[PDB]
Design a protein around this ligand. Sequence first.
Ligand code: NAG
Ligand code: NAG
Ligand code: NXA
Ligand code: CL
Ligand code: CL
Ligand code: ZN
Length: 577
Amino acid sequence: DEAEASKFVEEYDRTSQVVWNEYAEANWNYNTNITTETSKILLQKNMQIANHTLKYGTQARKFDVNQLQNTTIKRIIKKVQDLERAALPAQELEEYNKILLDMETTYSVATVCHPNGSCLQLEPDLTNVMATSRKYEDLLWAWEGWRDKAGRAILQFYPKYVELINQAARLNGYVDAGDSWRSMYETPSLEQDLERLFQELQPLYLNLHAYVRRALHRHYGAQHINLEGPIPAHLLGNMWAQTWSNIYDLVVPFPSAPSMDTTEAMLKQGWTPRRMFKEADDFFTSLGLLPVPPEFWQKSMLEKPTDGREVVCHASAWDFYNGKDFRIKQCTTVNLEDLVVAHHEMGHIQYFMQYKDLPVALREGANPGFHEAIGDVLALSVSTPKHLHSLNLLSSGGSDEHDINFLMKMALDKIAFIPFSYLVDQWRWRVFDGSITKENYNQEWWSLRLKYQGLCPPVPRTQGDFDPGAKFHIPSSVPYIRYFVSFIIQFQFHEALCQAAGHTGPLHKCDIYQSKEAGQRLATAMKLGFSRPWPEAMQLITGQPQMSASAMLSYFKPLLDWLRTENELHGEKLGWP
Ligand SMILES: *[C@@H]1O[C@H](CO)[C@@H](O)[C@H](O)[C@H]1NC(C)=O
Ligand SMILES: *[C@@H]1O[C@H](CO)[C@@H](O)[C@H](O)[C@H]1NC(C)=O
Ligand SMILES: C[C@H](NC(=O)O)C(=O)O
Ligand SMILES: [Cl-]
Ligand SMILES: [Cl-]
Ligand SMILES: [Zn+2]
């Protein structure tokens, strides 16, 4: 047993590195250049990797895992026994791979055309409309249009997608795909752990929702906003209403304290996509963490090409499984929002580099949530007025009004996102376990959109509509619940790192810039890769073992107080029906 396990892992590790690096490349070529040639080659390279997976997956399954004395070897072999999609029969595997490609290609090339000659794209066009327009009918056109284009187009695929991904899941020992995805956390109590967390952040959200619904009532008119009902999903400044920081202007707590146009600020001082990432790279190295290799700047696609190429714009980071080749693919726009997303992605790159010497099978985050949080943690410090001013993007600084305005801006981003990030997989886990048929896809999506977010669709939905497909992570088949976890624990890391950095005072005023003791804690944890259960990583960083919403509640605490008084004096009626 033991002698033969050890050897299997070594062979599996050295062959996977090669095969996976080739797949990455093909996959990279397609994402950054959507053509027929690059699609075929990608599909081609799918069968190769599936073959590698089946050879070692089958091998692995012949080992009695619970009877191996080594923990590191035992964890690797068990993971290898999960063939995932590769568990499917040749035929079903090729159909499945084609469906994923077709879904992701459909979403990435969809346009919404006008009567003004002009067809708009998600980035940056339709995104800019949702963030800057304050015209109900204009926002409605983009909101409805995008779903008419992307949403509708993904429906014909999805039912088959669900059938195939559940089969693949059952073929790997799980009940269905949701069960598979949830196991990535190795936490039986996951569902209930998360619902407790969600509930904890309820008062804070209900108070933000109500304060923002009042603001929108002020701007769009009583005839469009019910102060006792849900909010029209198209008025929050973001295509999916997942973050509401783009309508900061309509909800400024203290407008008497002026706001610097950070975007104008960045454009004026000539900030470019490259500059942004360089700044992100600087923050990481300031913490003593690793800088991105020169190769990174060479090969990355830090901005939407202009050579006619058609690409998958959505932000993502890439590991090429060779310990040197790491890239990021982002259609970066010059603004504060993307400056944060750039850090988020640089957070992924850092992780890749931190655990690049572990066996490939363990080259993952403690759990999906960790991978997602790293960059957001630093971004939290980058976003502080003080740090923003040191980048000459803000003028200041000091006043309680400037303090509450900042907390609001952050709340519009972080708090607003909680119910959404919770919702997405609540819908999918149910779709996967069969409680939601293709007959009720959309209806159930909006039941949850209302129940958790307090949102209603500006235009009644009709048969054929499949609004879930209008969200990247759906056709792209990327689990979403990792972001929910991310938003909870990033604050737990922020609070831990800040304590380490010697920060005293309100948590929201913390900036870990250049904190060596802070980078030391992150690095030690990122180094573990997936070698250990995540509670140990949570422990190395925060000094305890659990997710908790106390850090996030404490950060916003001042804002929570402000919100209660504010809503209370306007006789606001929290929540909806
Ligand atoms: C994109 O792919 C096509 C065909 O695969 C190729 O001809 C072209 O050179 C690639 N574009 C760029 C910019 O490299
Ligand atoms: C088992 O072997 C692996 C790889 O050689 C090693 O990383 C690990 O430390 C060993 N585990 C134990 C418990 O000895
Ligand atoms: C928050 C997440 N970020 C990402 O994909 O980089 C999203 O876009 O919905
Ligand atoms: Cl929607
Ligand atoms: Cl996940
Ligand atoms: Zn991410």
